[PDB]
């Protein structure tokens, strides 16, 4: 996200988002500083394991699918998906990885569909009882559990490069007052005077 005008206080006052909590910096004291680039990712996991999307923690999705760097000052936003994602008959388009070679690095995307070796034998295409397909689907049913109910989780991150800033608050303004001695403020000037 670049050259944008973004509002952040409407998310706290939306009154429909279950997890309005993250680390780094509060969104109330966030709009007073200017930022140059906004990142956004979208993924779907089930209910009760939404806690381990944070650096320095273990898990299955955290260690093998998606993780965060140690100096992560961004925010995480999640909400329920009872209507759109969950239906009758199941949805086999939502899958999560199981197998990879080593510990994950932050911020990379893997579409490696090649089956992961476990023993010393070669895999060679067809499943050789150890070289497994690392993707497993989800069984979506409207009478699932609380921890098995799918959630729509969106993470965001902020940075500060040498590029010029894009979004500051945009911090709004006040009304216009004329013919009175006021402290006028503008885009790049401050001073005291009367406006006519």
């Amino acid at each position: 996200i670049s050259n944008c005008v973004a509002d952040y206080s409407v998310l706290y006052n939306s009154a429909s988002f279950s997890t309005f909590k993250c680390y780094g910096v509060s969104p109330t004291k966030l709009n007073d500083l200017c930022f140059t680039n906004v990142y956004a990712d979208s993924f779907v996991i089930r209910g009760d394991e939404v806690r381990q999307i944070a650096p320095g923690q273990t898990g299955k999705i955290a260690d093998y699918n998606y993780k965060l760097p140690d100096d992560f000052t961004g925010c995480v936003i999640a909400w329920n998906s009872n209507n759109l994602d969950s239906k009758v008959g199941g949805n086999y388009n939502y899958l999560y990885r199981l197998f990879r070679k080593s510990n994950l690095k932050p911020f990379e995307r893997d579409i490696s569909t090649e089956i992961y070796q476990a023993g010393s034998t070669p895999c060679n295409g067809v499943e050789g009882f150890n070289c497994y397909f690392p993707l497993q689907s989800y069984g979506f049913q409207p009478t699932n559990g609380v921890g098995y109910q799918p959630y729509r989780v969106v993470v965001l991150s902020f940075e500060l490069l040498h590029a010029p800033a894009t979004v500051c608050g945009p911090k709004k303004s006040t009304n216009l007052v004329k013919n009175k001695c006021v402290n006028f403020n503008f885009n790049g000037l401050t001073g005291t005077g009367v406006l006519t």
Partner: antibody
Amino acid sequence: EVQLLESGGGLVQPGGSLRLSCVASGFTFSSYVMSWVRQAPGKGLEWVAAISGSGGNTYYADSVKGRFTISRDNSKNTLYLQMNSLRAEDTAVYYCAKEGTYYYGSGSFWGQGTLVTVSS
Amino acid sequence: EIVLTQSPATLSLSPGERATLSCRASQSFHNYLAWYQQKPGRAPRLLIFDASNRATGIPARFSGSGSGTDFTLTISSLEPEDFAVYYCQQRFNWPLTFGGGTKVEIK
């Protein structure tokens, strides 16, 4: 399946062979891949054999270089047992069991099994 | 190939103070472990179905903990079924050597 047919035992002298079976009926062989383990009175447990649920690859154990012969058929979904040159190591209990519907382990419920006794 | 070490055999003590199991295996794992309960004269059955999670038919008296190289439990309540033998089992590494368990000496 919630139940399993109870197998039998044998009192074969050393140097002979054993032929028993533990076969259920009306059960899908593709799911709940079979596994055989020895309940040793002593050292512990070790897996024996595991064949593909649709008929295919099977694996020999580390201590079994083809000594415990695995000749199983998928048309009748045969669950059997055959070996040669019987030894004093076979003084244990044979268990017929199966793990979850996936190939990797996800929970295995076991049977009562029958003990086999070696005496020369 | 894969070594399962099952305790230094010094935990055979009184069943008080909620003694745990020190099954150690310092090698590569995918946190896919299952545990078994055996009484003499009785065929063993499963305890957990994926990892640290009770299956159907057992209450929350057993709750696993640990990943990667170490795994343990916290027992909740004393019971006549606590005077029995626990087993440690792993699911990968298809040669599939298993644990040995340990004894409990009541004091």
